[PDB]
Amino acid sequence: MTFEVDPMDEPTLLYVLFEVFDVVRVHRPHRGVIETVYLRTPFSAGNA
Amino acid sequence: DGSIVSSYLTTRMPPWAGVRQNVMGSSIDGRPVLPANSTTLTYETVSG
Amino acid sequence: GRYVPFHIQVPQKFFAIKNLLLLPGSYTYEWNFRKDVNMVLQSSLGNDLRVDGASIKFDSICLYATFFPMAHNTASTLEAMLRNDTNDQSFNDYLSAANMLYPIPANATNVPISIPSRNWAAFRGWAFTRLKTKETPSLGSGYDPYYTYS
């Protein structure tokens, strides 16, 4: 991606939302147990 | 000069303190903190 | 007045635990709260409230939780239905976006970025906005000493 912006006399940032499906599924199988599985697609940040 | 800024690949900003700006900062009570590129941040300073 | 003893009710925003319906059990619930006056406060000029003598201090803190007084045969049936793995509660973040901040220099016109090589399955789109580097904090670190803006 390549953005052409107006010049400013100040350091500015560039905030891009790469829109994903940031989804959590929450499993509570027994009393006092929370098991959550997170998944976002495409930009998955899980090692598993 | 007349060069296009920027023509090199911009790597995204690291999400921690000391990279975003090399400005002079301030402590939680207001004491002036020297910038990140200063040579006084190669060690830590503990106040009595 | 300058000197304000406050009493505030701070909502929970993290989407997986924002609308979650907890089933019975004993759950620990721990959280970190900022004391940074440039983060917890907002001024109408944007001055550095650390230098300007602003100071927040947390005396005490409490967790409140309103329970629906459901019948004990109904809330035991609902507890038993919601522990099946087919009835697992599933939430999405409303933004649902990987957020990448790219530094633009002063008086810079062209900003080239790149994503190296990736499976782009279930990609939804882009939404971009230029921000100022002064007005953005370095989140991720526990304290940003260089964020002189409120």
UniProtKB/Swiss-Prot annotation, chain A:
Entry protein name: Hexon protein
Family of this protein: Belongs to the adenoviridae hexon protein family.
Location of the protein in the cell: Virion; Host nucleus
Subunit composition and interactions: Homotrimer. Interacts with the capsid vertex protein; this interaction binds the peripentonal hexons to the neighboring penton base. Interacts with the hexon-linking protein; this interaction tethers the hexons surrounding the penton to those situated in the central plate of the facet. Interacts with the hexon-interlacing protein; this interaction lashes the hexons together. Interacts with host dyneins DYNC1LI1 and DYNC1I2; this interaction might be involved in intracellular microtubule-dependent transport of incoming viral capsid.
Top-rank lineage group of the source organism: Viruses
Residue window of the full protein shown: 903 to 950 of 952
Gene responsible for this protein: L3
Additional notes on this entry: All late proteins expressed from the major late promoter are produced by alternative splicing and alternative polyadenylation of the same gene giving rise to non-overlapping ORFs. A leader sequence is present in the N-terminus of all these mRNAs and is recognized by the viral shutoff protein to provide expression although conventional translation via ribosome scanning from the cap has been shut off in the host cell.
Induction of its expression: Expressed in the late phase of the viral replicative cycle.
Sequence positions bearing Phosphotyrosine: 38
Function field: Major capsid protein that self-associates to form 240 hexon trimers, each in the shape of a hexagon, building most of the pseudo T=25 capsid. Assembled into trimeric units with the help of the chaperone shutoff protein. Transported by pre-protein VI to the nucleus where it associates with other structural proteins to form an empty capsid. Might be involved, through its interaction with host dyneins, in the intracellular microtubule-dependent transport of incoming viral capsid to the nucleus.
Swiss-Prot record, chain B:
GO molecular function, one term: hexon binding
Lineage top rank: taxon: Viruses
Induction: Expressed in the intermediate phase of the viral replicative cycle.
Alphabetic keyword roster: Capsid decoration protein, Capsid protein, Coiled coil, Host nucleus, Host-virus interaction, Virion, Virus entry into host cell
A GO CC term assigned to this protein in UniProt: host cell nucleus
Broad class of the protein's primary localization: virion
Subcellular location: Virion; Host nucleus
Gene Ontology BP, a term: symbiont entry into host cell
The keyword Acyltransferase belongs to this UniProt entry's keyword annotation: no
Function, in words: Structural component of the virion that acts as a cement protein on the capsid exterior and forms triskelion structures consisting of three molecules that stabilize three hexon trimers at the center of each icosahedral facet and fixes the peripentonal hexons. Dispensable for assembly. During virus entry, recruits the anterograde motor kinesin-1 to the capsid docked at the nuclear pore complex thereby subjecting the docked capsid to a pulling force.
More info: This protein is only encoded by mastadenoviruses, and may therefore play a role in mammals tropism.
Subunit structure: Homotrimer. Interacts with hexon protein; this interaction tethers the hexons together. Self-interacts with adjacent proteins. Interacts with kinesin light chain KLC1; this interaction leads to capsid disruption at the nuclear pore complex during virus entry into host cell.
Family of this protein: Belongs to the adenoviridae hexon-interlacing protein family.
Domains as described in the record: Three N-terminal domains of hexon-interlacing protein form triskelions between hexon capsomers.
Protein name: Hexon-interlacing protein
Taxonomic classification: Viruses, Varidnaviria, Bamfordvirae, Preplasmiviricota, Tectiliviricetes
